[PDB]
Each structure stands twice: as structure tokens, then as C-alpha cells.
Amino acid sequence: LQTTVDGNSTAISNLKSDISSNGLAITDLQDRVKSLESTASHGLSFSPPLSVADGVVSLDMDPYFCSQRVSLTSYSAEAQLMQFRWMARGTNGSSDTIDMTVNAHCHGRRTDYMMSSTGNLTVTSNVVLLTFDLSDITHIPSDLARLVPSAGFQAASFPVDVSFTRDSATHAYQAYGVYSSSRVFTITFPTGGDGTANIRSLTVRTGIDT
Amino acid sequence: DGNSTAISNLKSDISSNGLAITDLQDRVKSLESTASHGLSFSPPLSVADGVVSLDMDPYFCSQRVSLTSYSAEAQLMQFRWMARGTNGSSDTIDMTVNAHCHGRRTDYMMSSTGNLTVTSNVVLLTFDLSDITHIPSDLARLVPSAGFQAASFPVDVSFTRDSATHAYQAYGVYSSSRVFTITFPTGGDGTANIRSLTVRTGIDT
Amino acid sequence: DGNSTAISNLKSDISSNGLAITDLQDRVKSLESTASHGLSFSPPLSVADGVVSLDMDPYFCSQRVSLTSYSAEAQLMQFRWMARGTNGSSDTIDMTVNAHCHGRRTDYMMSSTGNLTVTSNVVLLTFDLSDITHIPSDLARLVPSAGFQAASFPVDVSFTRDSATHAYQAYGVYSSSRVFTITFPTGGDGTANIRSLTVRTGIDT
Numbered sequence: 001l002q003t004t005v006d007g008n009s010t011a012i013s014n015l016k017s018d019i020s021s022n023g024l025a026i027t028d029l030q031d032r033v034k035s036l037e038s039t040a041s042h043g044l045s046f047s048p049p050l051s052v053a054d055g056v057v058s059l060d061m062d063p064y065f066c067s068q069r070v071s072l073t074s075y076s077a078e079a080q081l082m083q084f085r086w087m088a089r090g091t092n093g094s095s096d097t098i099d100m101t102v103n104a105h106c107h108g109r110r111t112d113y114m115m116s117s118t119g120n121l122t123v124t125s126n127v128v129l130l131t132f133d134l135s136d137i138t139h140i141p142s143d144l145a146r147l148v149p150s151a152g153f154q155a156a157s158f159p160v161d162v163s164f165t166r167d168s169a170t171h172a173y174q175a176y177g178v179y180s181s182s183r184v185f186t187i188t189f190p191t192g193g194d195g196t197a198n199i200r201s202l203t204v205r206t207g208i209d210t
Numbered sequence: 211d212g213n214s215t216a217i218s219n220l221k222s223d224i225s226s227n228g229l230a231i232t233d234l235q236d237r238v239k240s241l242e243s244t245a246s247h248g249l250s251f252s253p254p255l256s257v258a259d260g261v262v263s264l265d266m267d268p269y270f271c272s273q274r275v276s277l278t279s280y281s282a283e284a285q286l287m288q289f290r291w292m293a294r295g296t297n298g299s300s301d302t303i304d305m306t307v308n309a310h311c312h313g314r315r316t317d318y319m320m321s322s323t324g325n326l327t328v329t330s331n332v333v334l335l336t337f338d339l340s341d342i343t344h345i346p347s348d349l350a351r352l353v354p355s356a357g358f359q360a361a362s363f364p365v366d367v368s369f370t371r372d373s374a375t376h377a378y379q380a381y382g383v384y385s386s387s388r389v390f391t392i393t394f395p396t397g398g399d400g401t402a403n404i405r406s407l408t409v410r411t412g413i414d415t
Numbered sequence: 416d417g418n419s420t421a422i423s424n425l426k427s428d429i430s431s432n433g434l435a436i437t438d439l440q441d442r443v444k445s446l447e448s449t450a451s452h453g454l455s456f457s458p459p460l461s462v463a464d465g466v467v468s469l470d471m472d473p474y475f476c477s478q479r480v481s482l483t484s485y486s487a488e489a490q491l492m493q494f495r496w497m498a499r500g501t502n503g504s505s506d507t508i509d510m511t512v513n514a515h516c517h518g519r520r521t522d523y524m525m526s527s528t529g530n531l532t533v534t535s536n537v538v539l540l541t542f543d544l545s546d547i548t549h550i551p552s553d554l555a556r557l558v559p560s561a562g563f564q565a566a567s568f569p570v571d572v573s574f575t576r577d578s579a580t581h582a583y584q585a586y587g588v589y590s591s592s593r594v595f596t597i598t599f600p601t602g603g604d605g606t607a608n609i610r611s612l613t614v615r616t617g618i619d620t
């Protein structure tokens with residue numbers, strides 16, 4: 001009986017020792033888990049144009065502007081040469097309309113217009129305004145987005161080159177256009193004289209950022 | 211019996227350890243669920259030694275804190291290029307070419323002092339990179355992008371014919387990455403000679 | 416013997432706790448190895464309060480879900496620039512300048528007021544920002560990028576001399592970030608006056 005009690009006491013002391021070892025290991029774990037819980041990269045999110053899908057972070061790229069070939073580079077979208085007819089509308093120095101043959105070269109988010117006319121435009125003053133509304137294109141191109149300027153571009157007048165024949169002589173002017181809305185721009189240019197007169201063989205060259 | 215008290219005390223400590231273990235298990239299971247553990251990066255994003263970068267083509271873009279336009283130096287290349295009549299001419303003509311490369315835009319300004327014999331009212335004139343002998347060091351600035359190659363593109367031409375100037379808004383098209391052909395009116399019909407050909411155009415590379 | 420049973424029971428629970436601890440140590444070691452810990456982000460990527468962004472120059476690019484071209488408003492600046500003859504002229508000439516700033520491109524359309532006295536067959540004409548009257552607020556739009564400044568660039572010029580028009584494909588080059596000089600033929604020799612000078616060029620900013 002004395003040996004029972006004394007032996008059990010030694011066993012208890014050994015158990016105490018094990019419990020303290022577990023106690024210490026618990027504290028080390030608690031410190032380690034506290035440290036892990038403070039990890040800065042935990043909870044990261046990504047704002048457009050960055051995005052995550054199934055743990056893969058990507059840069060979302062507009063193919064008319066940029067692409068990747070390992071590094072971020074310029075546009076991958078195919079260029080187009082659009083060909084259509086556009087009835088331009090004279091105002092402010094003309095009441096007439098003129099049918100323009102238009103080639104629109106769309107490359108990246110730049111669209112360059114090259115236009116020439118058949119027929120003529122009667123003018124009454126030394127300056128005329130000519131309006132280009134997308135609704136007046138004879139057979140609207142499918143890719144309409146390429147003919148609409150960006151919000152940034154729309155905010156300013158932009159240069160337009162014009163040439164035409166008046167009294168069997170060709171005149172040419174550095175002129176300007178401006179968008180009155182996303183679908184409509186108007187150009188203003190000298191007519192090469194005063195009074196009622198006719199100009200023909202009108203060419204318009206300009207370009208826009210889309 | 212003194213032993214019984216010691217046993218009762220040990221039980222309480224074991225139970226305390228158990229509770230702390232359960233708390234740790236819950237916290238570690240929470241840590242294992244952390245959404246950011248699974249993260250990788252797709253080009254043009256890349257990671258090296260824990261640093262995540264945007265890899266940038268210096269001909270297109272750069273950083274000055276924010277992502278901005280190209281840092282690559284522009285170049286004004288000057289060289290001669292033999293162009294080849296390929297329809298409406300079987301003649302050739304040596305062009306003096308200035309190529310202004312700025313970012314991924316390359317603008318051509320060409321002129322000639324020679325003569326081109328043409329046989330019809332339209333001529334096709336071909337520009338193959340192989341016909342540049344004194345090549346510049348960055349020949350990739352003369353190669354259009356895949357996207358740009360997909361369409362015809364505007365070319366202005368001017369020349370003299372029978373002592374008269376002619377100028378036309380004309381078009382070119384790449385038949386391959388190294389070759390484009392311009393198509394333009396010759397200013398008349400039959401066999402004739404045109405002089406002082408100027409060509410102005412540009413490409414996106 | 417009774418406390419012997421109780422000691423066996425305590426032993427079993429202590430053992431269970433130790434094994435639970437070993438498993439937690441393995442899981443925590445694994446968590447400590449997590450590759451995504453300590454990720455950082457290099458310009459133009461940045462992080463603020465755990466949100467990772469692409470910092471975008473609004474004159475170059477923007478996002479509309481995807482990374483796209485500039486959002487900044489275009490501007491048509493109008494000002495007077497007094498250009499200075501720096502070879503083949505010691506004269507000055509006042510230019511009316513429209514600068515069309517769209518994204519990081521600035522296109523100049525200039526027309527002259529008055530006559531420029533030239534002395535030779537080529538003139539150099541200098542455009543220093545200090546000579547602009549009523550300097551725009553966004554002066555940054557008139558300063559070429561470091562990349563652009565590295566090369567000469569095309570400039571179109573036209574003017575009148577002795578009642579005849581002349582027009583040349585010419586070139587300019589920046590001597591410093593604030594100053595460029597254009598070089599062009601004057602259409603003759605000796606002392607003369609040219610008028611109605613127009614200049615058209617563009618720069619990447």
C-alpha cells in the first residue's frame with residue numbers, strides 16, 4: 001500500500017511534466033497563429049482593369065488598344081477599311097446636302113476618314129457648316145463603334161482638311177470640326193468667296209480617337 | 211488520497227490544454243481557407259521573388275508611377291528602297307525613304323528622282339523589305355502588326371506626267387509581313403513615263 | 416490500484432493532446448511556407464488598404480472594365496508663338512498656333528503673321544516655349560516625351576516668296592525639352608522676305 005501511493009505519485013509527476021510540455025507547445029502555436037493572422041497579403045482584392053478568376057489574376061485588355069506578347073503591347077484587333085456613302089448637311093451658309101463617298105480606316109482606336117464627293121453644294125456666304133450625323137450614312141456599317149469618338153476626344157474641336165473646286169480653281173483650307181453629340185459632328189470652312197456660288201469635288205480628311 | 215487531489219488538478223490542466231487546442235484548430239482551419247493563398251498571375255502580369263510586375267513593351271508603354279506611353283527612343287531612319295512595278299509596269303524605281311519611328315508608329319516619307327515606265331491607267335508598285343540593301347538596325351520598325359496587316363491602308367502619291375503634276379489618295383495592302391503593294395492612278399492611258407514619285411504613308415507595328 | 420486507473424486515463428488524454436499538437440505544428444509549418452505571403456507590387460501596380468490597382472495615366476489609358484485608351488479631355492489650345500530665325504535669318508516672326516492635344520499626341524497647326532527676312536537657301540526657325548504669349552495652363556502638352564525627343568521629326572511648311580507659293584516636306588528636332596528648331600528651304604537665294612508661313616507638325620508628349 002505505501003508502494004502503491006508512492007509509485008502513483010511518481011507517475012503523476014511524470015504526467016505533470018508532459019502536460020507542461022503540451023502547455024508550452026500550445027503557447028508557441030498560439031504565437032505562430034497570431035503572426036500568421038497578421039499576414040498583410042491576406043484579404044487582397046483587385047480593382048479593374050485587374051481581375052481574379054479561380055485564383056488567377058489577369059489584366060483585362062481592350063483588344064482595340066492593347067494586348068500581350070509576354071509584355072503589354074499595342075492593339076491586336078484587326079484593322080478595317082470601311083467604305084460607305086454619307087449625306088452631309090449644309091447649314092449656316094448653305095441649305096444644300098452633298099453625297100460623300102467615305103473610306104474610314106480603322107486601326108486600333110484611331111479612325112481616319114477620307115471623303116470625296118460627287119455633285120456639289122450651293123453656298124451663300126464666305127463660310128459654311130457641314131454636318132455628318134451617323135443617321136445619314138446610306139447603309140450603316142455593322143461596326144458602328146468605330147465611327148463614334150471617345151468621350152475624351154469629343155471634348156475639343158479637331159482639325160479637318162478640306163478642298164474643293166470653285167470657279168474652275170481648287171481651294172484648300174485647314175479647317176476644324178466639333179462633335180455636338182456622340183453621333184454628330186459639324187465642320188466649318190471657308191467657301192473661297194462671297195455670295196451665291198457652287199462648290200464641287202469636295203474632299204474632307206480628318207480622323208478621330210474612338 | 212493526496213494523489214486524488216493531484217489527479218483532479220491534472221485533469222483541469224489537460225482540459226484547459228484541450229480547449230486551447232480546439233481554438234487553435236478553428237483558427238488554423240480559418241487560415242487554410244484564406245482566398246489569397248491560391249494566387250497566380252497571367253501575362254502581362256508576372257512575379258519574381260515575390261514581386262509582382264506589369265511587363266511593359268517599351269515601344270508602347272512605360273511607368274512614371276502610372277502606366278503611360280512609350281519610353282523607347284524614336285528614330286528617323288534614312289535609306290534607299292527599290293520598288294517594283296508589279297501590274298501596269300514591269301519597271302523598277304529607287305526611292306529615298308525617311309521612316310520616322312515613334313512608339314509603334316512608323317511613318318514613311320519617300321521621294322525619287324527617277325522615272326517609272328507604266329503601260330495602263332493604274333499601276334501597282336511593290337515594296338519588299340528584301341529590296342532595302344542598307345538595312346537599318348531595327349528592321350522590326352518596318353514590319354506592320356498582325357492587326358494592321360488585316361486591311362488596306364491610305365497612301366498619298368504625287369508624280370509628274372507629261373510635264374503635269376498628278377496627286378491621288380491611294381491605298382496599299384500587305385501581302386505578307388515583309389511586302390506591301392500600293393495601287394494608284396497613272397494620270398492617263400497607254401505607255402507613259404512618270405517622274406518625281408513621292409509616297410507618304412504610315413503603319414502600326 | 417484505483418488511482419492507477421485514473422493515471423492511465425490521464426495518460427491517454429495527454430497523449431491525445433500531444434498528437435493533436437503535432438498535427439497542428441505540421442499544418443502551421445505548411446501555412447508558414449505559403450508562397451503568397453509577403454507579395455508586393457511594383458509600379459505601375461500599387462496597393463492601398465489591401466486593394467491592388469493599376470495606376471493609369473489618364474492622357475494614355477483608362478479602364479472601362481478592360482484597359483483601354485485615354486480618358487482625359489482633348490483640348491484645342493490657341494496662342495501666339497514668336498519663332499526666331501537661328502541660321503539663314505536673324506529675324507523673328509509671330510505664329511498663330513492651334514495645338515490639338517488628344518491623349519498624349521499634340522498636333523500643331525501654325526500660320527504666320529507678317530514677313531520673315533531670310534538670307535540664304537535654307538533657314539532654321541526656332542520654337543522656344545519661353546516665346547509663347549499667354550502660355551496655356553497644361554504646358555505639359557507642349558513638351559515632347561524623352562523618347563520622342565531622341566529623333567528628328569517631320570514638319571510640313573509652306574510660304575509665299577515673290578508672289579509664288581512654295582511648300583516642302585521638312586524636319587524639326589528638339590535641342591532640349593523646351594526648344595525645337597525646324598529646317599526648311601526658302602525657295603531661293605540671298606536676302607528675301609517670305610510670307611504666309613504655315614507650319615504643321617505633331618509631337619508625342
Ligand SMILES: [Cl-]
Nearest residue numbers: 005008213418
Ligand atoms: Cl494512489
Ligand SMILES: [Cl-]
Nearest residue numbers: 019022227432
Ligand atoms: Cl495535456
Ligand SMILES: [Zn+2]
Nearest residue numbers: 170171172192
Ligand atoms: Zn481659296
Ligand SMILES: [Zn+2]
Nearest residue numbers: 039042244449
Ligand atoms: Zn496565409
Ligand SMILES: [Zn+2]
Nearest residue numbers: 375376377397
Ligand atoms: Zn491626275
Ligand SMILES: [Zn+2]
Nearest residue numbers: 424425427428
Ligand atoms: Zn479522459
Ligand SMILES: [Zn+2]
Nearest residue numbers: 434435437438
Ligand atoms: Zn494526428
Ligand SMILES: [Zn+2]
Nearest residue numbers: 506507530532
Ligand atoms: Zn522681321
Ligand SMILES: [Zn+2]
Nearest residue numbers: 580581582602
Ligand atoms: Zn518651292
